[PDB]
Design an enzyme around this catalytic site. Structure first.
Site, PDB file in Angstrom:
ATOM      1  CE1 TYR A  27       1.008   1.793   3.825  1.00  0.00           C
ATOM      2  CE2 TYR A  27       1.482  -0.762   4.327  1.00  0.00           C
ATOM      3  CZ  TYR A  27       1.239   1.044   4.518  1.00  0.00           C
ATOM      4  OH  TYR A  27       2.041   1.042   6.050  1.00  0.00           O
ATOM      5  CG  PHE A  37       0.583  11.625   1.954  1.00  0.00           C
ATOM      6  CD1 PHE A  37      -0.189  12.166   0.783  1.00  0.00           C
ATOM      7  CD2 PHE A  37       0.696  11.610   3.030  1.00  0.00           C
ATOM      8  CE1 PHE A  37      -0.550  13.361   1.182  1.00  0.00           C
ATOM      9  CE2 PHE A  37      -0.488  13.179   3.263  1.00  0.00           C
ATOM     10  CZ  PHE A  37      -0.961  14.250   2.304  1.00  0.00           C
ATOM     11  CG  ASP A  38       5.429   6.847   4.891  1.00  0.00           C
ATOM     12  OD1 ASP A  38       6.520   6.433   4.754  1.00  0.00           O
ATOM     13  OD2 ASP A  38       4.602   6.629   6.437  1.00  0.00           O
ATOM     14  CB  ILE A  57     -10.437   0.493   5.727  1.00  0.00           C
ATOM     15  CG1 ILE A  57      -9.228   0.544   4.725  1.00  0.00           C
ATOM     16  CG2 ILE A  57      -9.865   1.201   6.839  1.00  0.00           C
ATOM     17  CD1 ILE A  57      -9.050   1.945   4.366  1.00  0.00           C
ATOM     18  CE1 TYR A  83      -5.959   5.342   5.996  1.00  0.00           C
ATOM     19  CE2 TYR A  83      -5.452   3.630   6.277  1.00  0.00           C
ATOM     20  CZ  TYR A  83      -5.811   4.258   5.739  1.00  0.00           C
ATOM     21  OH  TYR A  83      -4.768   4.490   5.382  1.00  0.00           O
ATOM     22  CG  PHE A 100      -4.267   4.610   0.645  1.00  0.00           C
ATOM     23  CD1 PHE A 100      -5.302   5.759   1.169  1.00  0.00           C
ATOM     24  CD2 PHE A 100      -2.850   4.862   1.724  1.00  0.00           C
ATOM     25  CE1 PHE A 100      -5.873   6.380   2.179  1.00  0.00           C
ATOM     26  CE2 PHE A 100      -3.479   5.459   2.753  1.00  0.00           C
ATOM     27  CZ  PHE A 100      -4.788   6.349   2.508  1.00  0.00           C
TER      28      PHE A 100
END
Length: 108
Positions: A27, A37-38, A57, A83, A100
């Site tokens: 992911y 992003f991270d 999720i 989330y 993601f």
């Protein structure tokens, strides 16, 4: 509805995760604007979980559920199914859509 998957790199397109089985994928954080992003791959460690359990999720559930081993695609789902609701400062927006990048590595 609430979760969309956009194929990026066709893989096996034959081996898919079973409901209740443990699937391993990578992911990567990403915003609808493209902002990176991270990511999990950043640490050379894929994330594994039981597709269908309450450990992940809704987004990932359906996303990975319709994913194939060795296949890479973007997982754009809403906060209601993830989330994204709460989120965090400088990490996740307040109840905002998130994308993601999920990449299937193998199924177990």
């Amino acid at each position: 509805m609430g979760v969309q998957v956009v194929t990026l790199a066709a893989g096996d397109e034959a081996t898919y995760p079973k409901a209740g089985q443990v699937a391993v994928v990578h992911y990567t954080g990403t915003l609808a604007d493209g902002k990176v992003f991270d990511s999990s791959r950043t640490r050379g460690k894929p994330f594994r979980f039981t597709v269908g359990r309450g450990e992940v999720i809704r987004g990932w559930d359906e996303g990975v559920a319709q994913m194939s081993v060795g296949q890479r695609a973007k997982l754009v789902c809403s906060p209601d199914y993830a989330y994204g609701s709460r989120g965090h400062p400088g990490v996740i927006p307040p109840n905002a859509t998130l994308t993601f990048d999920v990449e299937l590595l193998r199924v177990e």
